[PDB]
Amino acid sequence: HMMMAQPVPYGKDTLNNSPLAADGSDFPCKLRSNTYQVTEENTAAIGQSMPLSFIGSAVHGGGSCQVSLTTDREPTKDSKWIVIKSIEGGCPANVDGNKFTYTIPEGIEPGKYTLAWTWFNRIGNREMYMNCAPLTVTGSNFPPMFVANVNGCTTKEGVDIRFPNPGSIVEYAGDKSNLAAEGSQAC
Ligand SMILES: [Cl-]
Ligand SMILES: [Cu+]
């Protein structure tokens, strides 16, 4: 169980480290009282490295994550999300104990967006974690975001999944021996 600390999520005060409900009832963004309350607006220039960091009680052997954008500031189940980074393996970390960045790429227009971090844990229950944050891209090719484990598509335990459509910005941070094969079916 983990949650995003940077960028600062919407509704930080009520955001917990639980995965999305298995029945899809709180997709997207962990629908609740104040799902889309701006705690702190996050701001990024195109091409600027931005920190992506996480806190929680178990990394579940890592797994794979995406960072995605939508123009909707109150996304619904029908929102269009586009991927700007995939991390296949090693996300959010490899081990528990007492690192990542993203960049807004050329092709994203200045404006206000919602950013989502999504995570498919390697080990344990077949879950999807998702936290959303307000992002302003200052100044004012990208595939659809992968969804599994909350929509009847179930991933395989033990592997760092490869997203069918990872986009052109991909990082690998896990053990090569756990990485699913290129072209493998994720669910
Ligand atoms: Cl941990
Ligand atoms: Cu957990």
From Swiss-Prot:
Highest taxon above the source species: Eukaryota
Glycosylated sites: 98
Cysteine pairs bridged by disulfides in the record: 29-132, 65-91, 153-187
Residues that hold Cu(+) according to the record: 1, 60, 74
Role this protein plays: Lytic polysaccharide monooxygenase (LPMO) that depolymerizes chitin via the oxidation of scissile beta-(1-4)-glycosidic bonds, yielding C1 or C4 oxidation products. Catalysis by LPMOs requires the reduction of the active-site copper from Cu(II) to Cu(I) by a reducing agent and H(2)O(2) or O(2) as a cosubstrate. Active on chitin but has no activity on other substrates, including diverse mannans, cellulose and starch (data not shown). Primary chain cleavage yields predominantly aldonic acid oligosaccharides with even-numbered degrees of polymerization.
Homology family: Belongs to the polysaccharide monooxygenase AA11 family.
Name this polypeptide is given: AA11 family lytic polysaccharide monooxygenase
Natural source organism: Aspergillus oryzae (strain ATCC 42149 / RIB 40) (Yellow koji mold)
Lineage start: Eukaryota, Fungi, Dikarya, Ascomycota, Pezizomycotina
Gene encoding the protein: AA11
